[PDB]
Write an enzyme that holds these catalytic residues in place. Structure first.
Site, PDB file in Angstrom:
ATOM      1  N   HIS C  53       1.113  -1.220  -0.278  1.00  0.00           N
ATOM      2  CA  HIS C  53      -0.080   0.415  -0.129  1.00  0.00           C
ATOM      3  C   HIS C  53       0.874   1.189   0.118  1.00  0.00           C
ATOM      4  CE1 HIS C  53      -2.291  -3.482   2.298  1.00  0.00           C
ATOM      5  NE2 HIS C  53      -3.716  -2.751   2.054  1.00  0.00           N
ATOM      6  N   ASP C  56       2.178   2.008   3.789  1.00  0.00           N
ATOM      7  CA  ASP C  56       3.101   0.773   4.116  1.00  0.00           C
ATOM      8  C   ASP C  56       5.025   1.308   4.282  1.00  0.00           C
ATOM      9  OD1 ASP C  56       1.525  -0.471   4.674  1.00  0.00           O
ATOM     10  OD2 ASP C  56       1.302  -1.515   2.621  1.00  0.00           O
ATOM     11  N   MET C  87       2.785  -5.644  -7.950  1.00  0.00           N
ATOM     12  CA  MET C  87       1.183  -5.523  -7.324  1.00  0.00           C
ATOM     13  C   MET C  87       0.855  -4.150  -6.649  1.00  0.00           C
ATOM     14  SD  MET C  87      -1.064  -5.251  -4.884  1.00  0.00           S
ATOM     15  CE  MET C  87      -1.044  -7.552  -3.982  1.00  0.00           C
ATOM     16  N   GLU C 180     -10.755  -6.216  -4.578  1.00  0.00           N
ATOM     17  CA  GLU C 180     -10.404  -7.500  -4.176  1.00  0.00           C
ATOM     18  C   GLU C 180     -12.135  -7.714  -3.421  1.00  0.00           C
ATOM     19  OE1 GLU C 180      -7.129  -7.424  -1.062  1.00  0.00           O
ATOM     20  OE2 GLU C 180      -7.690  -8.964  -0.168  1.00  0.00           O
ATOM     21  N   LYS C 182     -14.695  -8.399   0.026  1.00  0.00           N
ATOM     22  CA  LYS C 182     -14.756  -8.976   1.536  1.00  0.00           C
ATOM     23  C   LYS C 182     -15.737  -8.760   1.954  1.00  0.00           C
ATOM     24  CE  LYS C 182     -12.710  -8.926   6.124  1.00  0.00           C
ATOM     25  NZ  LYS C 182     -11.719  -8.246   7.005  1.00  0.00           N
ATOM     26  N   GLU C 216     -10.217 -13.209  -2.113  1.00  0.00           N
ATOM     27  CA  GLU C 216      -9.063 -13.534  -1.530  1.00  0.00           C
ATOM     28  C   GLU C 216      -9.539 -14.565  -0.286  1.00  0.00           C
ATOM     29  OE1 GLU C 216      -7.192 -11.268   1.493  1.00  0.00           O
ATOM     30  OE2 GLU C 216      -8.016 -12.896   3.406  1.00  0.00           O
ATOM     31  N   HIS C 219     -11.475 -14.242   2.834  1.00  0.00           N
ATOM     32  CA  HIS C 219     -12.984 -13.113   2.524  1.00  0.00           C
ATOM     33  C   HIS C 219     -14.310 -14.357   1.509  1.00  0.00           C
ATOM     34  CE1 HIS C 219     -10.057  -9.780   2.219  1.00  0.00           C
ATOM     35  NE2 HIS C 219      -9.938  -9.719   3.469  1.00  0.00           N
ATOM     36  N   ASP C 244      -5.009 -13.804  -3.472  1.00  0.00           N
ATOM     37  CA  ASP C 244      -4.742 -13.863  -2.878  1.00  0.00           C
ATOM     38  C   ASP C 244      -4.610 -14.805  -1.609  1.00  0.00           C
ATOM     39  OD1 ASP C 244      -4.360 -10.461  -2.589  1.00  0.00           O
ATOM     40  OD2 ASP C 244      -5.453 -10.213  -1.122  1.00  0.00           O
ATOM     41  N   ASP C 254     -11.768 -12.170   9.533  1.00  0.00           N
ATOM     42  CA  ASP C 254     -10.570 -12.203   8.860  1.00  0.00           C
ATOM     43  C   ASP C 254      -9.882 -12.517   9.125  1.00  0.00           C
ATOM     44  OD1 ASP C 254      -9.414 -12.796   5.983  1.00  0.00           O
ATOM     45  OD2 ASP C 254      -9.107 -10.309   6.464  1.00  0.00           O
ATOM     46  N   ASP C 256      -6.887 -14.141   8.485  1.00  0.00           N
ATOM     47  CA  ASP C 256      -5.881 -14.292   7.211  1.00  0.00           C
ATOM     48  C   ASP C 256      -3.980 -15.549   8.181  1.00  0.00           C
ATOM     49  OD1 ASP C 256      -6.665 -12.308   6.201  1.00  0.00           O
ATOM     50  OD2 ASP C 256      -5.782 -10.324   6.556  1.00  0.00           O
ATOM     51  N   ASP C 286      -1.165 -13.192   1.219  1.00  0.00           N
ATOM     52  CA  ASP C 286      -1.812 -11.883   2.070  1.00  0.00           C
ATOM     53  C   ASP C 286      -2.332 -12.701   3.774  1.00  0.00           C
ATOM     54  OD1 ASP C 286      -2.972  -9.711   3.195  1.00  0.00           O
ATOM     55  OD2 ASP C 286      -4.755  -9.462   2.260  1.00  0.00           O
TER      56      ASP C 286
HETATM   57 CO   LIG Z   1      -8.469 -11.226   4.622  1.00  0.00          CO
HETATM   58 MG   LIG Z   2      -6.269 -10.017   0.225  1.00  0.00          MG
END
Ligand SMILES: [Co+2]
Ligand SMILES: [Mg+2]
Ligand SMILES: [Co+2]
Ligand SMILES: [Co+2]
Ligand SMILES: [Co+2]
Ligand SMILES: [Mg+2]
Ligand SMILES: [Mg+2]
Ligand SMILES: [Mg+2]
Lengths: 387, 387, 387, 387
Positions: C53, C56, C87, C180, C182, C216, C219, C244, C254, C256, C286
């Protein structure tokens, strides 16, 4: 490899391999199985025993004469094969009279009939050698909030189980009860919906020692709960009398897939737990061969249940035997979890300055738990990718 | 109408209206509230009292001198307003030292620190007049199967609660403990995940009479369970010591919406149950004003909690007072549910031919339960569409 | 074995191994990572590239001078290692200004700022060689029904994506967009909650060819959906631009988790699908190393992501190469599924008496699908128990 | 009040009030209804029309002579009452021949039979005046990952719908198709599981203008999705051809409760949306009177569907008409959501310094959205507690 034998204690309900494939949206896809045929086919696969509802074995409404005939045929098959009957149960859910429950129907005459139907099958179960009598209260519940006063319903549920305990006690039977929880389906919500709720309820019965739980893999997973954790709590309480093994993919209708299907990692941790705890009851499969299958698929699905248990047993044993995993368990301080927190006592703990006043919270906080490395070793063993 | 007053026993955690809006994906949207301001603003809204974690009131790591200062300020606000403090709790989840738990951390020194931190706040809670001490074990649990031996963890959890019971007993405090279940978040699975599991665990403690449950609406709904049914079971067991009211839309992250939001019909049946059972503990709101809101929205959301309780209380009272509903309850045989199934005893039931041999199963099966008409009367009352 | 190399196209977000462990109930447990260190550590593990991002890499609110400095440092690390940046994405969710969304905030000035912030990072992404620009609209949504007019919000979402497409078109950039989905968290419900909803929305944009999906694993599983099925539908539509990979245990917050954790069988079928379809984009992780872990656990968790992909690739390849499985696929008529139903045309089908008038429905119905035997062969291959 | 009349466009499937109460665990509790009786009873309640599957009206396997007789009886009842038939559908799920699907069965001969069975009922539907032909692919799916190649299955699904579109086009019929999604049950996962997936699939058909969606309240809620949001997206795309109204309590088996039951607030926001958008298709109830009920309860449950719609319509209209709510909508900037983000164009936006360079992010971030006050006004209107 992975060939099952009677010593592995695998059992199957008559209603499992005998499910004809009728679901809420479709007719039966398989013909009815003769229970005698199921006994003989299951013995050939390596099963230890079979289980039954009263209505699986004796068609509902049978006379005393037809009833004796169905039982003699079945008993002859058991004697021929050496197959055991370690558990039995009542059908208090199929007939329309039970549409609002058996033990907790609002109608009192239905509750009395439910008890007499159950007591009659307990007599038969003991005669055939069953050690556990299961109760799944699939119709005890409600779709709407005003239909059921739940405190009164729990009074009636306690009354019924207390009367069953008085009955087996007065007859001198050596049989114990196991309650099987389910959160929903076919009712909108079912009473005693999880292992925990059933364990708590048992503690209010007159003779709690006679009662435990029969948890089912898929049922706890229908509430999104961790089935191995729930089994651990039942073992910790001394209440794991029996268990129903199958598979389930998440929160939805009760799938009753073959064991190993669904949540594969949860099945690995369950087998790890049962074997390391030395659980010695039946490994019972409550599953339905999918209605896509013909009769060859029914027996392949049943064989798969046993095969998957045996594969997971081998992987879990290899995981625990691996010195690298033992080192990882010490690195994550699983062994410190077994030590008492304060065997020195309350007074010593209060006066221990290193437990609070002088406790270095930042050093403790900086310690890694090393859980991911441990879990990847578990993954490697499950997949046979060690070496 | 629907104006709250202290007699309605509404209480709020300092951490509720004081939530700054930090979530897993975003920074705080509101400034920190001074606990003194929260007391005064909540008294003006009509609240009965406030509750607190130790770390809400005293910043973590405070010296004995700063600690006394924070407590005197807070005590001065309570004395000024007449606000009560009926419940308190420990924060055993925020600081990184608790990343693997407090009472069930694998590291033994962390478990000892967890107990000393808790005991210190019990002393303060009693001094301020709290009658219930809540424990939410939000970090007790695991993301992976090998990280936690759950039987050992339950041993350590039992050890901790038994030591707390020995402590309040030796001090002669008149305070009781309430365990607050949650199925998951922030751990992948949390130990004692539902009301049922917590009720069962209490029965294995040395002094079970000192312990009950603090169920939270949204938490049971995170497992898809029926919250009023679970509350009924806690009342039936005599264990509803406290309750957390809020809202939740289904199975997902813990939303802590204002009470009334989320599952509105479940809130109606909950209020119906609490009021008809004569529950007399605090009506405590564990909610978070959404981080979209500024400070005016925080107080509007808090007022909404109390307003929605009072509206639902009125509708449920009108539902039960309606002679048409009383007739509907008789038509669905709710009154027969209250009658014993077999007060005539086991022997009489066995010899009663009308309970089995002569039971007319088809006539019984044909009886409608009339549940839909009853539920539509409940819907009409909830919506104010009677008349 | 199972050692990753750059040819396996494994990529990681800076925000993954760099997650400091702050969750809704607790503070950070790890120090911040320097993005330069993450590049170098990931290259040593065998990664192909990193993603980011804007926030980041460049702390929010940086001047043009500090910004250039952060980018030069990062670019120097990429040039030193050969690591690619396939990406990039925008952070439109952390800062409080985005508390009601970026592209669909009710406040118009926020929506304009959201677009300018995004456009600025597209320029940087293209300069660094990114081929896909991802948008996760984590704040686009609502906790309450009246807060968002969803038809107007979709108008504004379409407006924003159309303006981004006009921008890359006018600049002649060779970059494509991936949405993406969610379903929820951090909003109560998020707009475009699944792969399907995002695919349908793309078809109403002015230049649909520029847009695909970045699904993802966890998700889709937060809605209880079948992730491989959803990926198949994206491939069928030609829209799988990026993916992802991670793990998730059912319907909850979520998680991850590292790839392979969570639903292991779904991961096997996903890898089977990606490899048999010849997906050639990045295999992007991710995931969040659990906050229980120190920095050694962070890198063990990241290595585990790649290892589990490589193990599953090997098992799926062996499954498809097995002549016994090929026979099982024919026995279940997977090959007939590939044949057109009626390439003879509508008229021929209408006049075909064997398709209806003379169709033997009972013979067709009696055919078993043999799905259970096929699935047990899949289980055997996943577990390495063939032979 | 709240008396339904034909102008309210309420419709019911023959299979709804006619459900005999057979569920996966129990036999039928009600006798079969004669479709002629259902038409006449529904007209007396105020219904606009009825809908049907082919097999509801004509028993499967009927000769051309018995078929004509069943249709003439039904047509005579419609002519007698003025009842309309606005929608019809095919049963491609009950008979065992469809155990692996209709349009996407692996067996090609089954797929051809599925198309001929469907085409035959389209002819009948048009003759009776239906404007929408619904397809619910309840058997299209899988319990296991290898059983279905989903890309091939979507090819076959596209082939079938394209052939149906060629057929109605060549016949000059003025009927449109609506796909009804469902995420699971009776298959483990069903293809096109949500509104979004079905909308995306329609865009790949040869004549997309002929196809829309028939979303069902409970089905989207079985995936934990926001049903009003999904309906908004279907309206935004121009694809809401029909709708199935009922109730569902969360993620579990498909309950098909009467409309208003289940998620009451979601029903309020749905009715608000349908009425403010000017949806003018049928308000169709796909519900099952619970099997606890006798025939009086069946008709009370059906009346309740219509009553609850009419009550919610009144409350939603009063909510939108309230000047205090209009003020609250402006305070939350719902009106700014309707303004274009950048009608001044991409170039103007890029050169607008107040959109980025000079944007005061802290002032914007400090603005409250006032969503909680708005939502409490919505709650007050739903409960009739305004005034
Ligand atoms: Co997630
Ligand atoms: Mg993701
Ligand atoms: Co089951
Ligand atoms: Co909560
Ligand atoms: Co449905
Ligand atoms: Mg079972
Ligand atoms: Mg709480
Ligand atoms: Mg429907």
């Amino acid at each position: 490899n992975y060939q099952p034998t009677p010593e592995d204690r695998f059992t199957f309900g008559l209603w499992t391999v005998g499910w004809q494939g009728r679901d809420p949206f479709g007719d039966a896809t398989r013909r009815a199985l003769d229970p005698v045929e199921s006994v003989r086919r299951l013995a050939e696969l390596g099963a230890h025993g079979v289980t039954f509802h009263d209505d699986d074995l004796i068609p509902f409404g049978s006379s005393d004469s037809e009833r004796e005939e169905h039982v003699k045929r079945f008993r002859q098959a058991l004697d021929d094969t050496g197959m055991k009957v370690p558990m039995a149960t009542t059908n208090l859910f199929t007939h329309p009279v039970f549409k609002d429950g058996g033990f907790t129907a609002n109608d009192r005459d239905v509750r009395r009939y439910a008890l007499r139907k159950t007591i009659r099958n307990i007599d038969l179960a003991v005669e055939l050698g069953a050690e556990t009598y299961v109760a799944w209260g699939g119709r005890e519940g409600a779709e709407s909030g005003g239909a059921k006063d739940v405190r009164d319903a729990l009074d009636r549920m306690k009354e019924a189980f207390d009367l069953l305990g008085e009955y087996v006690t007065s007859q001198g039977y050596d049989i114990r009860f196991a309650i099987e929880p389910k959160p929903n389906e076919p009712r909108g919500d079912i009473l005693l919906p999880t292992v925990g709720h059933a364990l708590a309820f048992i503690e209010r019965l007159e003779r709690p020692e006679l009662y435990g739980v029969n948890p089912e893999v898929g049922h706890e997973q229908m509430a999104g709960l961790n089935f191995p954790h729930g089994i651990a709590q039942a073992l910790w309480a001394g209440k794991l009398f029996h268990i129903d093994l199958n598979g389930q993919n998440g929160i939805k209708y009760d799938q009753d897939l073959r064991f190993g299907a669904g949540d594969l990692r949860a099945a690995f941790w369950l087998v790890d737990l049962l074997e390391s705890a030395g659980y010695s009851g039946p490994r019972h499969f409550d599953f339905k061969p999918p209605r896509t299958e013909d009769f060859d698929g029914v027996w392949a699905s049943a064989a798969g249940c046993m095969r998957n248990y045996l594969i997971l047993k081998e992987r879990a044993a290899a995981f625990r035997a691996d010195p690298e995993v033992q080192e990882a368990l010490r690195a994550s301080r699983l062994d410190e979890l077994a030590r008492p927190t304060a065997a020195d006592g309350l007074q010593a703990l209060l006066d221990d300055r290193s437990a609070f006043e002088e406790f270095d919270v930042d050093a403790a906080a900086a310690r890694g738990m090393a859980f991911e490395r441990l879990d990847q070793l578990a993954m490697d063993h499950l997949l046979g990718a060690r070496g």
